[PDB]
Symmetry: C2
Subunit: 92 residues, 2 copies
């Protein structure tokens, strides 16, 4: 279980969607193209700190709160997150 | 339980609660033993949600009654949209 094993709480995509910002709105907010946001949401493995820091700043989160990884890892992570909640709830 | 539920300084809507933990309407329905349709409707307009259903949200997302935004589809809109404008304004205002 990846979400439970992790200090991370959110993916890049989740930080964005939590406020229903479009990739385009977020690009304009962070001074990079949409395609940069697409790419970083697909695979965060090589994200530049200059960009990571804007995420931490805009969304008031710490480095540890953010999940970083490739498309596969993001999936296992979010997927695992959903099951956690379901399973915790069912434990009563 | 702190790296299980994400601590949130502000209120969240029912839709946001589901959405935050990446569940579909159908899954949440099953989890709370109500139709997908019941979830759809309460997400649009929560004015009349049953406290039995509300408690289930509280218990599954670990939020207090005062942490959940309840309201019609317009109040919802204003509320989520104000949060958006805020995130944006706060960020630009540091630069």
């Amino acid at each position: 279980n990846l979400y439970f094993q992790s200090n991370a709480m959110k993916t890049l995509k989740e930080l964005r969607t939590d406020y229903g910002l479009t990739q385009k709105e977020l690009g304009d907010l962070f001074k990079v193209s949409s395609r940069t946001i697409q790419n970083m949401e697909k695979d965060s493995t090589n994200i530049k700190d200059s960009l990571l820091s804007k995420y931490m700043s805009a969304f008031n989160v710490k480095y540890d709160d953010i999940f970083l990884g490739n498309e596969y890892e993001n999936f296992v992570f979010t997927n695992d997150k959903k099951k956690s909640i379901i399973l915790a709830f069912k434990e009563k």
